[PDB]
């Protein structure tokens, strides 16, 4: 039971449920305690043994490793109307949405470091057979001391497959035009569209499209000064036709992506950590 955890302040809540800061009583390890309401669970899965759990738990177990770029599931509990996930908690930490709110558009060197790290975290998820489906600033945490990003929140995710998805419940303004128009997308190229909306958001300080019509037209306007190489990569990730978008390898070989900072260097220069 959760006499093993001291519950601290609420960190956030939403369609999925609520999350609290917590501390594991035995060793004082910082954790986050996420309560997932059953009736809001968009997908269920089951365990190697074969217990009926949120898909989110299946996905988190598939990606669990010593790789710090994806959040680690430490433990979980079932309750009558909810599950309770116990997750790693970096400290001090700030999500990327709040970081951008506070700091505005990010210098390119900082955006390059963060974007590279996110691409390494997403490639790990895909190599583990997991499609995240809600990559966006609020689902990325920054371990401020170490300059390391972590992808969180597999609540909209699915097992990765090579055929079409026809369901989607992640964030609409990050979803690609083929979802908006046809309600169908493939995993990797929809991931890459969202990576293009994320990199825009980092270098311009806001997302590029609010309305369905803007998504489907796909015309990108730069509202801040951004280098032509960065603009070229963003407009490549946001190719209207799915098969026109780059693969991960093509993104990480892009001229804009070269000479990325190490995370510690990133913390020292940009995060004062
Ligand atoms: C769109 N998503 C829905 C869930 N929402 C809450 C959430 N927070 C955390 C989650 O993992 C964490 C690990 C450490 C810390 Br600190 C916070 C979290 C998570 O899965 N959801 C983030 C935004």
Alpha carbons 154 and 225: distance in angstroms, whole number: 33
SS3 22: strand
Q: The tokens of 1 are what?
A: 């039971």
Alpha carbons 136 and 121: distance in angstroms, whole number: 13
| Whether residue 211 is found in the same domain as residue 249 | yes
| Whether residue 7 is found in the same domain as residue 133 | no
CATH number of the domain at 25, please: 3.30.200.20
Atom of ligand 1 nearest to the CA of 89: 14
Alpha carbons 204 and 85: distance in angstroms, whole number: 34
Last residue within a domain, chosen from 91, 118, 141? 91
Pocket of ligand 1 (CB under 6 A): 11-12, 14, 16, 19, 32, 34, 71, 87, 89, 93, 134, 138-139, 141, 152-153, 155
13 is in an annotated binding site: yes
The protein residue with its alpha carbon nearest to ligand 1, atom 18, reads 32
| Whether residue 85 is found in the same domain as residue 110 | no
Atom of ligand 1 nearest to the CA of 15: 3
Q: The tokens of 132 are what?
A: 């995240």
Alpha carbons 135 and 16: distance in angstroms, whole number: 16
| Whether residue 30 is found in the same domain as residue 132 | no
| Whether residue 86 is found in the same domain as residue 211 | no
Q: Nearest to residue 244, comparing CAs of 192, 181, 172, 197?
A: 192
Longest distance between any two alpha carbons in the chain, whole Å: 55
| Whether residue 26 is found in the same domain as residue 117 | no
- Which technique? X-ray
How many Å lie between the centroid of ligand 1 and the Cα of residue 179?
Answer: 25
| Whether residue 132 is found in the same domain as residue 188 | yes
Give the angle 11-17-177 at the CA atoms, nearest 5°. 100
The protein residue with its alpha carbon nearest to ligand 1, atom 14, reads 89
Angle of helix 187-204 relative to helix 96-103, nearest 10 degrees, comes to: 30
How many Å lie between the centroid of ligand 1 and the Cα of residue 226?
Answer: 30
Q: Nearest to residue 141, comparing CAs of 66, 91, 208, 205?
A: 91
Question: Which resolution, in Å, applies to this structure?
Answer: 1.9
In the residue annotation, 167 being an active-site residue is answered as no
How many Å lie between the centroid of ligand 1 and the Cα of residue 243?
Answer: 31
252: phi > 0 → left, psi -120 to 50 → alpha, else beta; which?
Answer: alpha
155 is in an annotated binding site: no
| Whether residue 86 is found in the same domain as residue 102 | no
The number of distinct structural domains making up the chain is 2
| Whether residue 101 is found in the same domain as residue 235 | yes
Alpha carbons 93 and 148: distance in angstroms, whole number: 10
Q: Nearest to residue 56, comparing CAs of 158, 161, 160?
A: 158
Last residue within a domain, chosen from 73, 91, 109? 91
Q: Which of 27, 43, 81, 134 is the catalytic position?
A: 134
SS3 232: helix
Alpha carbons 273 and 264: distance in angstroms, whole number: 8
69 is in an annotated binding site: no
| Whether residue 189 is found in the same domain as residue 104 | yes
| Whether residue 203 is found in the same domain as residue 262 | yes
How many Å lie between the centroid of ligand 1 and the Cα of residue 222?
Answer: 30
How many Å lie between the centroid of ligand 1 and the Cα of residue 19?
Answer: 7
- Cα first-last separation, the chain: 36
18 is in an annotated binding site: yes
Structural domain span for residue 79: 1-91
CATH number of the domain at 100, please: 1.10.510.10
Last residue within a domain, chosen from 91, 116, 141? 91
13: which strand partners? 18
- The b/e string for 135-150 (b: 16+ C-beta within 10 A; e otherwise) is bbbbbbbbbbeebbbb
Atom of ligand 1 nearest to the CA of 90: 16
| Whether residue 36 is found in the same domain as residue 76 | yes
136 is in an annotated binding site: no
Q: Where do the DSSP E strands lie in the chain?
A: 5-13, 17-24, 29-37, 44-46, 52-54, 73-78, 82-88, 93-95, 130-131, 140-143, 148-151, 158-159
């Amino acid at each position: 039971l959760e006499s093993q955890y001291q519950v601290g302040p609420l960190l956030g809540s939403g369609g999925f449920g609520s999350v609290y800061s917590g501390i594991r009583v035995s060793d004082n390890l910082p954790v986050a305690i996420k309560h997932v309401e059953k009736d809001r669970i968009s997908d269920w899965g089951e365990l190697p043994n074969g217990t009926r759990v949120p898909m989110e738990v299946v996905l988190l177990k598939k990606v669990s490793s010593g790789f710090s770029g994806v959040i680690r599931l430490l433990d979980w509990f079932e309750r009558p109307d909810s599950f309770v996930l116990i997750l790693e908690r970096p400290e001090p930490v700030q999500d990327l949405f709040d970081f951008i709110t506070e700091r505005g558009a990010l210098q390119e060197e900082l955006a390059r470091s963060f974007f590279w790290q996110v691409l390494e975290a997403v490639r790990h998820c895909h190599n583990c057979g997991v499609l995240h489906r809600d990559i966006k600033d609020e689902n990325i945490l920054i371990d401020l001391n170490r300059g390391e990003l972590k992808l969180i929140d597999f609540g909209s995710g699915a097992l990765l497959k090579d055929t079409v998805y026809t369901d989607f419940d992640g964030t609409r303004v990050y979803s690609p035009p083929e979802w908006i128009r046809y309600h169908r997308y493939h995993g990797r190229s929809a991931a890459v569209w969202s990576l293009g909306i994320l990199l825009y958001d980092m270098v311009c300080g806001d997302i590029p499209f609010e309305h369905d019509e803007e998504i489907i037209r796909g015309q990108v306007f730069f509202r801040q000064r951004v280098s032509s190489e960065c603009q070229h990569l963003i407009r490549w990730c946001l190719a209207l036709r799915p098969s026109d978008r780059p693969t991960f390898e093509e993104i990480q070989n892009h001229p804009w992506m070269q000479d990325v900072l190490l995370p510690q260097e990133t913390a020292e220069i940009h995060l004062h950590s």
